[PDB]
Symmetry: D4
C-alpha cells in the first residue's frame, strides 16, 4: 500500500477490503476475464487505474475509445467470473458510499483465449 501512489490509496484500501481472497494471489486460476471502465473524466479514471493493482486484479493505463465528447476508458483485468463482476460492484460501492466520486458506466468482459498475466 506504501508503494501505491497516494491519490488512489482511499480507493485502494476500500477495494482491498471489499474484494478479499478472490482479489489476492490465486495462481491456479487463468486470467480469461477483465472489466472495462469507460467515462468522460480522465482524472477519475486515472485514479481508478492506480487504485487497482493486485494479485488477482490488474488494471492497464487510461485509454481512449473509438468515436463515430472524447470517451476515456481503463480496463481492469481479473482471474475468474466472480472477481470480474465483483470489481464492477466494487466501484459502484465507492460511488454510492463516496458521493464526491464521479459516476462511471462499465461492462463485464470475457476473453476466450488466456491473457499473459502471471
Amino acid at each position: 500500500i506504501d508503494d501505491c501512489p497516494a491519490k488512489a490509496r482511499p480507493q485502494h484500501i476500500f477495494y482491498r477490503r471489499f474484494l478479499g481472497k478472490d482479489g489476492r494471489r490465486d495462481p491456479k486460476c487463468q486470467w480469461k476475464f477483465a472489466v472495462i471502465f469507460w467515462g468522460n473524466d480522465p482524472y477519475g479514471l486515472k485514479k481508478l487505474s492506480q487504485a487497482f493493482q493486485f494479485g488477482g486484479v490488474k488494471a492497464g493505463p487510461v485509454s481512449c475509445l473509438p468515436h463515430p465528447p472524447i470517451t476515456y476508458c481503463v480496463y481492469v483485468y481479473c482471474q475468474n467470473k466472480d472477481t470480474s463482476k465483483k470489481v464492477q460492484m466494487a466501484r459502484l460501492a465507492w460511488e454510492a458510499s463516496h458521493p464526491l466520486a464521479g459516476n462511471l458506466q462499465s461492462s463485464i468482459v470475457k476473453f476466450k483465449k488466456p491473457l499473459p498475466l502471471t
Copy 2:
C-alpha cells in the same frame, strides 16, 4: 425514507443509491429470487431487515437457523438474478465502507415457483 425507522436510515440511503433502477418498482418481473443473510448478531440483522424495503427488494423479519451459538438470519427477497447478487454485494459494500458494521456471511437464493409479492 421518512417512513423507514431511523436506525437503518444510514443503510437505507446507501442501498437506495447503490441499487438504483433494478431495486425500485419493476412490476413486470416475477419474484423468483431472495438472498439470505445469516449472522450471530441479532442487532445488526434487525438493522439490515429494516434497511431493505423497496419496490424490487423486500426483507422479512429476523429468524433463527436450524442447530445440529445461536444463528440468526434474515431473508432479503428480490425480483431477478441481477438484483439478487447485487444486494449481496450491497451489504459487503457497507461492511467495507463502514468498518464499525459487523461481518455477515450470506448466499444467493433461487426459488423455482414464484412468491406472493406484488
Copy 3:
C-alpha cells in the same frame, strides 16, 4: 422420535416413512437446497416445523413474510434436488391423506452457495 415433541409425531412418523434414505444422514452431500412453506395459519406451520428434523432435512422456526392478513412461513432445508421436491410432495401427501390438516402453499428453493448445516 421420543425426543421429538408429541404434536408433530403423527406427521413425523409419516414423513419418516415417506422420505426414506434420501431423508436420513447423507453427509457427502452439500446442502444447497431448502423448501419454504408459507401459510396464514401459525398453528399448523409450527407443527410442520416440529415435524421436520432429520439427518438430511432440517426446518427452521416459524417466520413472517413481507407485506406490501399476516403470512407466516417456515423454511425446510434439504440436501439435494431430489429431497427438496420430495418434501414438498411429502406435505401434500399428508394434506390429501389427512383432510383435517390445513392447506399450505409452497415452492421449492435453490441456494447457490452452500449452507452451514452438517
Copy 4:
C-alpha cells in the same frame, strides 16, 4: 367415481385429491410422459391400474416384464413432466399413509414422440 370399480376407490379418492389440476383435463398439453409401476404382486398392481383413470392421467392393464419370480407391471400415462413424477410421489404417499398397502418400486418415463391419447 361411481363409474370406477369399488376396490380402487380408496386409492382413487386419494389420488384425486393429491394430484389436483395437473391431474384433470389439460387438453393443450401433449402426452409425452408415462410412469411404470413394477411389482411382484399382481393383486395390488391391478388395484393401482383401476385407481388411475383421469383427464391427465391414464393407466394401462397389468403386464409382465422380461425375465433374464415373475415381475408384473402397469404403466401410468401422464401429460407433462410435473404429473409424471407427481404420480410416482402419489403412490409412495399411499404406501406411507396406508401401511397395509404393498411396496412398489417405480421409475419415471419419458417418450420422445407423442402418444395417441386425447
Copy 5:
C-alpha cells in the same frame, strides 16, 4: 435361434443381422431405454415380441393401451439411446423389405431411473 419359436425366426434372423454389436450383450451399459410398438393387430405384435429377445434388447408380452378399436402394444427394452432408435428403424426396415408385414406406429422411450434387467 433354435430356442426362439419359429414364427418370429424370419424376423429374428433379420434383427440379429441389422442390430449387430449394440444389440448383443453389453453389460457395462445400464438399461434406461425402451421402445413401445403399438398397433391394432395382436397377431403381428406377438410375432414382434417373440422376435426381440437379445443381450442388449428385450421385449415384454403384448399389452393393451388406455382407451378414452382396441389398441395393443408391446414394449421393447434397450440399453442406450443408439439401440433405442435403431430398433425403431429395425422394424421399419422389415416393413419396407417385407410388404406382407403389417404397418406399426411406434415411439422411442426414455426412462429416468434404471430398470431391473441384467
Copy 6:
C-alpha cells in the same frame, strides 16, 4: 422411378418405402445435413448413388478419399437431422435384408452453413 436407371431400382423402391414423408419434398426445411458412405467397392457405391435421388435426399457422384487400398465414397445429402440418420439406417436395412449387397461403413454429417440445393 422410370427415369431412374434400372440397376438401382431395387434399392430405389426400397428406400422410397423406407423413408416416407421425410424423404420427399419438404421445401420449408434447409439442407444442413448429408451422410457420407465410404467403401472399397466402386460398383456398389455407384449403385447407391443412383439409388438416392429424392425431394429431401440427394446423392452426389462417387468420389475418392484421402490416403495417408483405394477408398471410394459417395455423399448423400439430406434436409434435417431425422432424415440424415434415417438414410444411414436405410442402407443397413438393405444390407441385412439383402445379404448379397456389400457392407458399407458410414457416418452422419452436419454442415453449419446451408447448402445450395432447392
Copy 7:
C-alpha cells in the same frame, strides 16, 4: 513441399504459414471435421485440392454436386473445430491477398462418427 506438385505450391506455402501448429500432425485428435469448397471452376478447385495435404488437414479429389451450370466441389478434412473454420478463413485470405484467384463459396462441416484418417 518438393513432393507437392508445383501449381499449388504458392497456395501450399501460404496455408503452411497461415495454419501453423493446428495444421500439422496432431495425432491425439480425432478427425470429426471437414470443410467443403464448392465452385463452378474445376481448375481452381483442383489447385485447392493439391494445395491442402497436411498432418492435420487433408483434401480429397474434385467432385460434382447434385443438380436439381455444373457445380464442382472438393472436401477438405480437418481434425478439430478450430482448424475446420481456420481453413475456411485460410482460403478467403488467399482470395483477398491474391485477387487473380477465383471466388469460392464454402461451409464448415461436422461429422458425428470419426473418419478413417490417421
Copy 8:
C-alpha cells in the same frame, strides 16, 4: 479510403476485401464483441489501429498492458461473434501473405453488457 491515412492503406484495402458484408454497416446488431491485439512493437500496432475503422469494426488507440519488456496493445471492436474471430483471422492472413509484417498474438473478447458504439 482516401480519408484513412496512407500507412495503413495496404492493410485497409486488404481487410476491406477480407471481411466483406459482416465488416460494413450492420446497425441492427449490438456491439458485444471486441478483439485485443497485443505485441511488443508499437509501430505495427499503430498501423493496425489505423487499419481498422469500419461500419462493423472499430479500433481504439494503442495502449499498454499491466506488467507483473513493455507490452503494447490495441483493441479492435466488432458487432457479432462472427466478425470477432474473423478479424483475428484477418490479421493472421496479412502476416502469412506479407512476411515483412510483424507477428502479433491476440485473443477474441466477449463483453456482457453492450458498448456505446453506433
